[PDB]
Design a protein around this nucleic acid. Structure first.
Ligand SMILES: [Mg+2]
Ligand SMILES: [Mg+2]
Ligand SMILES: [Mg+2]
Ligand SMILES: [Mg+2]
Ligand SMILES: [Mg+2]
Ligand SMILES: [Mg+2]
Ligand SMILES: [Mg+2]
Ligand SMILES: [Mg+2]
Ligand SMILES: [Zn+2]
Lengths: 108, 217, 152, 115, 304
RNA sequence: UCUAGAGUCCAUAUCAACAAUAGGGUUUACUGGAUCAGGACAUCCCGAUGGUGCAGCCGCUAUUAAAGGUUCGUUUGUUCAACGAUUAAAGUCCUCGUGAUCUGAGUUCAGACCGGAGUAAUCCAGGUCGGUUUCUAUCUACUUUAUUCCUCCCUGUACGAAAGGACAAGAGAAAUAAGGCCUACUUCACAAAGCGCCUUCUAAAUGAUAUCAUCUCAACUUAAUACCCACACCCACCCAAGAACAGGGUU
RNA sequence: UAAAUAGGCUCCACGAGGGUUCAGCUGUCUCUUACUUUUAACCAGUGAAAUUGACCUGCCCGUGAGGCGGGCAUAACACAGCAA
């Protein structure tokens, strides 16, 4: 059907500003104790995750530049090595994806 | 190494303790009556006690068309034709009325559920009541009978040609025209056999069940 | 009523669900780490685990080969499954994938999730460590370790 | 489930029935408060343009465990005062008629086979 | 502020705390197994018109069980887990009705409870239970808090009442909820198949309170009366109660003696205050059976 | 209400004529069905009691009783009626009760035909076939308050003029209603369901006004428990809990 | 048909014309049930329209009805349903 009467600003305020409709204050924010950026407990530090995705993208660009075209999933493991890092004794027989910047401190 | 399907429990959330008590009671029932090994398709003769008589014994011989259930109640259906009338009876194994169960002819057919016999011609389900057993070599695989069957013509009771039944014991090329096998195959579901997460892996369960069954001796 | 139904409903039906999960799983096997909506990744985790289980049986088995044929779409990955992933987890008997939640998607504000196969070459996800063992509460609990061990 | 408007095949040698007629016997009423009829529930039949009392002796509907599940809705014609009209029965009748009270003693003295 | 127990513990500390609290729970559970070497209360002989505490069981599942007369009887399995009498309230502390006992069941974690409940259980020397329920008993049926209760509390041959939370169907329309013959299908019944008809008559400009309408279903406590007990498993503490019992599996139900006015007597031969396994009165076998159960291991029945 | 007339004798076992005292309508000539139902009792059944010409179950009337129930079909639609099978019964009415819940017929929508009236157009409180009423809920209100039947003992006692044939008390079996479950069957398959299963608690005694008597608008004495039940958390995950929020579990 | 107000100038062929009947078929029904998709409910973006005297918008009985009278009830507030 249709309304029988306009609804006043008072009723509309008792509806719109009722607590159930308010935005709740979040009790689960904190500071990355080492890195020092904001984060929720159960979620990754956004800044750290972005700085990881950047390096993943650069590595993957090198991988694409080396594999040539599509349909070339290798049949061996892969290892990524930064400048001035000779292939360790454990990484022989694994594809090497050379990169041209110093290894990040967070890359172990 | 054949573990009767009853002891394998349905996937669920019931408490293991329930199944342990179930199996304890069952095995305690298997030592007063020999519950033989019979697959769906076998021929059995079941001897029970008449409750409505004054202590008479009743014998019925038929083909095990379906074997379902679990725990202390699981059952099997025996189909037969007597005087041209097609009867079935659903017998509970662990019931304290079944006196004995003779495996009169241990067989095993292409499909694990011989329900379509309700539609096959009457002679594919007829058996002689007073028919003697047949021996079998101990270290022999259970024979796999191959008998495809011929159906009563038009109104099948449960529309067997669908893929979801996966029946392989019916002569479809005869009773169904080639066209009807193209409309009855748009329901194929090619993704249902490759769904890795619907597979109930029951190796680690049947192993412990065997430990229990053998230890109960 | 939906008591005891473990499978999400997504896509345009059951088939599209299997196909969506198949594309997610193929991306995972190809790159070893993918960011996808949280619920879809949680549905695909079980399939990725069981795919590694099937891949351990090895090429020679035919059932595993058919399964990996269905569940991998660019077939260059089937070698990998049977020669880089399944060999890699010859020791672990479970839990080959780690799944995290990440900042919600910018456009549609969906609940995201990064899922990866343990042990890959990629830079490591910023996992959340627990509190250092030298914190006050941990030190008191360490004292209790000692004092309870000596008594017992 | 032998309810109103269900075809039942008379199996009693049916001095009356068993003769050709373009209709087939139909149940027009079940002598139970609810419509459904199970074994032993004596019903009313329209057979050969006539109304005759009946007695169900088998049905395709699954019952309890240890009782037979036939594949045809079998009925025996009974006269109003309980006497069976026929003199024989060939199709097997279940042994579950010696149970719960009713006019069943005569119908077992006239059959020949059980299950 | 806001936090859970093992948020700040370190990697090598969570297993230790788990083991320590589990060991303490087991120790406290074991340190109550003998309630007569502790200080019991008076044990009066039963007399007519008395009521005795009941149990908090857990619903396992169902099974059949036959009888010498040849019939079938489904039954439900009830496992008594950690049933301890937790509290006592006096006759006129409830202001006239009766004396009351508070019995708890199904031990639960201790990191997931409110501070008050942990304080209560700490002063009582037990680990927290899941459900606490209040039984109305006479004065002479009192049991000291801290004593355990065991499936042998009952005996076959009696009747018993069971109360639990039904299964929650959620929000339900009117035919799944009240058995309403909805409106027919085709013949043109557009956009009305499973709908309520007229909610109320026309002269009254209101719908009565207590009108049957869509809404939440189940998930309310309810009681089944008259259930008989066939078997008791005194080694695993199972009760085999006839018929079906509300609730789902693994949910706690409240069991007490039948209150119907045909079983008011026959509370005599039962162990009155409770069953104490330490009484040492011809220790009970593994399975107690009713007079009319075709128990396993017996010859197959015959009707001659 | 007078019985007055009858009824094999006799008003009261039945009709009970006229009239009187009561509650209620009569418009044409010179609106059903489905769905859900709320309510009254002027009760159809079940329950309790009186008399009987029922010598007895049942019948007949009379008082009391509204907690519960009050079937399925063929033909047809001023809405009824007839008919078949049943049933313990297929009650009489108010709120079409109920069309922002759904449907049909109509009566009054344009098409066409038949019959009557008319010079014709057209009419006809006639008969046929066909034929479109849309709604996103603002406000109120509301959304968790065990009966019957059959069978059998008890048996064919009393009652009874022969003949027929009781209570009180129990025991089985079925259905329905409410409530709940998934061990089996069934549709199906980590579960939801039913066709399945379980539970349901006005005749006397003493006796005055009126010393006998009298049942007393005389005094006076007799013929439901159960269910729920912990002040203070909530980030995350799981759930037999769930629309969101809530609720159970995380040892 | 168990039961019936229904059906039963000649003139082949034809009819999305009207009425009736046999046999089958089927969830039309006895009597509903499960699953899937859209809708749905929640989060995020964009964002209408009929309607609207004012409203601080209860129930029962009476008058002639949320608003009058006489009784009763009554802390405020969302969200999803229903249609008296
Ligand atoms: Mg069928
Ligand atoms: Mg979707
Ligand atoms: Mg529709
Ligand atoms: Mg179903
Ligand atoms: Mg035409
Ligand atoms: Mg929005
Ligand atoms: Mg009014
Ligand atoms: Mg609202
Ligand atoms: Zn960080």
């Amino acid at each position: 059907a249709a309304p029988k009467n306009r609804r006043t600003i008072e009723v509309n305020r008792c509806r719109r500003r009722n607590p159930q409709k308010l935005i709740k204050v979040k009790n689960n924010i904190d500071v990355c104790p080492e890195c020092g950026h904001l984060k929720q407990k159960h979620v990754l530090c956004a800044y750290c995750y972005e700085k990881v995705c950047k390096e993943t993208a650069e590595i993957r660009r090198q991988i694409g530049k080396q594999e040539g075209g599509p349909f070339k999933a290798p049949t061996i493991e892969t290892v990524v090595l930064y400048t001035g890092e000779t292939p360790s004794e454990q990484d022989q027989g694994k594809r090497i994806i050379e990169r041209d910047r110093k290894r990040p401190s967070w890359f172990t | 190494r054949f573990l009767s399907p009853e002891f394998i429990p349905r996937r669920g959330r019931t408490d293991p303790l329930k199944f342990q008590i179930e199996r304890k009671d069952m095995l305690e029932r298997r030592k007063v009556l020999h519950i033989p090994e019979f697959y769906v398709g076998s021929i059995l003769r079941v001897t029970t006690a008449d409750p409505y008589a004054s202590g008479k014994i009743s014998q019925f011989l038929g083909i095990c068309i379906q074997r379902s259930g679990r725990g202390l109640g699981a059952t099997f259906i025996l189909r037969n034709v007597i005087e041209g009338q097609g009867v079935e009876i659903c017998f509970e194994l662990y019931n304290p009325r079944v006196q004995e169960i003779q495996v009169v002819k241990l067989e095993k057919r292409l499909d694990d559920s011989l329900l379509y016999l309700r539609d096959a011609l009457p002679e594919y389900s007829t058996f002689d009541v007073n028919m003697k057993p047949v021996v079998q070599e101990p270290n022999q695989k259970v024979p796999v009978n191959e008998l495809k069957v011929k159906m009563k013509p038009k109104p099948w009771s449960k529309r067997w040609e669908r893929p979801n039944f996966n029946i392989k014991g019916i002569r479809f090329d005869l009773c169904l025209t080639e066209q009807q096998m193209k409309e009855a195959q748009k329901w194929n579901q090619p993704w249902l056999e490759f769904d890795m997460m619907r597979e109930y892996d029951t190796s680690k369960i049947e192993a412990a069940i065997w430990k229990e069954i053998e230890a109960s001796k | 009523i939906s008591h005891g139904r473990v499978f999400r409903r997504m896509g345009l039906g059951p088939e599209s669900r299997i196909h969506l999960l198949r594309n997610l799983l193929t991306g995972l096997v190809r790159h070893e780490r993918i960011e996808a909506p949280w619920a879809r990744v949680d549905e695909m985790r079980g399939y990725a685990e069981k795919l590694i289980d099937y891949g351990k049986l090895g090429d020679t088995n035919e059932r595993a080969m058919r399964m990996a044929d269905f569940w991998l779409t660019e077939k260059d990955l089937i070698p990998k499954l049977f020669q880089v992933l399944a060999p890699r987890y010859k020791d672990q008997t479970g839990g080959y994938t780690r799944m995290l939640q990440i900042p919600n998607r910018s456009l549609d504000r969906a609940k995201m999730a990064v899922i990866e196969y343990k042990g890959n070459c990629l830079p490591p996800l910023p996992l959340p460590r627990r509190d250092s063992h030298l914190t006050l509460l941990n030190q008191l609990l360490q004292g209790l370790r000692q004092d309870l061990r000596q008594s017992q | 489930a032998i309810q109103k408007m269900t075809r039942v095949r008379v199996v009693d040698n049916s001095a009356l029935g068993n003769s050709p007629y373009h209709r087939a016997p139909r149940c027009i009423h079940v002598y139970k408060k609810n419509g459904v009829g199970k074994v032993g529930d004596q019903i009313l039949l329209a057979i050969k343009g006539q109304k005759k009392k009946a007695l169900i002796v088998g049905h395709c509907m699954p019952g309890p465990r240890m009782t037979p599940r036939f594949d045809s809705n079998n009925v025996v014609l009974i006269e109003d005062n309980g006497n069976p009209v026929g003199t024989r029965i060939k199709t097997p009748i279940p042994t579950s008629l010696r149970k719960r009270e009713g006019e069943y003693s005569k119908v077992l003295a006239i059959a020949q086979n059980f299950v | 502020s806001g936090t859970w127990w093992d948020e700040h513990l370190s990697e090598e500390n969570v297993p230790f705390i788990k083991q320590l609290v589990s060991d303490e729970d087991k120790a406290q559970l074991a340190s109550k197994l003998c309630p007569l070497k502790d200080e019991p209360w008076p044990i009066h002989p039963w007399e007519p018109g008395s009521f005795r505490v009941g149990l908090i069981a857990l619903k396992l599942g169902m099974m059949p069980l036959w009888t010498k007369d040849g019939q079938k009887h489904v039954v439900t399995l009830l496992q008594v887990q950690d049933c301890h009498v937790l509290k006592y309230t006096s006759k006129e502390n409830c202001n006239g009705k009766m004396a009351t006992l508070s019995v708890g069941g199904k031990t639960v974690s201790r990191f997931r409870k409110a501070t008050s409940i942990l304080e209560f259980y700490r002063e009582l020397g037990l680990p927290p239970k899941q459900t606490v329920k209040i039984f109305n008993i006479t004065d002479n049926a009192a049991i000291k808090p801290g004593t355990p209760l065991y499936a042998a509390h009952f005996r076959p041959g009696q009747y018993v009442d069971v109360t639990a939370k039904t299964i929650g169907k959620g929000f339900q329309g009117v035919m799944k909820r009240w058995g309403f013959k909805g409106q027919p299908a085709t013949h043109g019944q557009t956009k009305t198949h499973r709908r309520p008809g007229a909610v109320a008559t026309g002269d009254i400009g209101r719908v009565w309170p207590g009108t049957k309408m869509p809404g939440k279903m189940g998930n309310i406590y309810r009681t089944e009366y008259g259930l008989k007990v066939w078997r008791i498993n005194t080694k695993h503490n199972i009760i085999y109660v006839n018929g079906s019992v509300p609730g789902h599996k693994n949910c706690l139900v409240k069991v007490k003696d039948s209150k119907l006015p045909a079983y008011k007597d026959l509370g005599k031969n039962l162990p009155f205050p409770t069953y104490f396994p330490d009484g040492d009165e011809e220790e009970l076998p593994e399975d107690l059976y009713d007079e009319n159960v075709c128990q396993p291991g017996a010859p197959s029945i015959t009707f001659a």
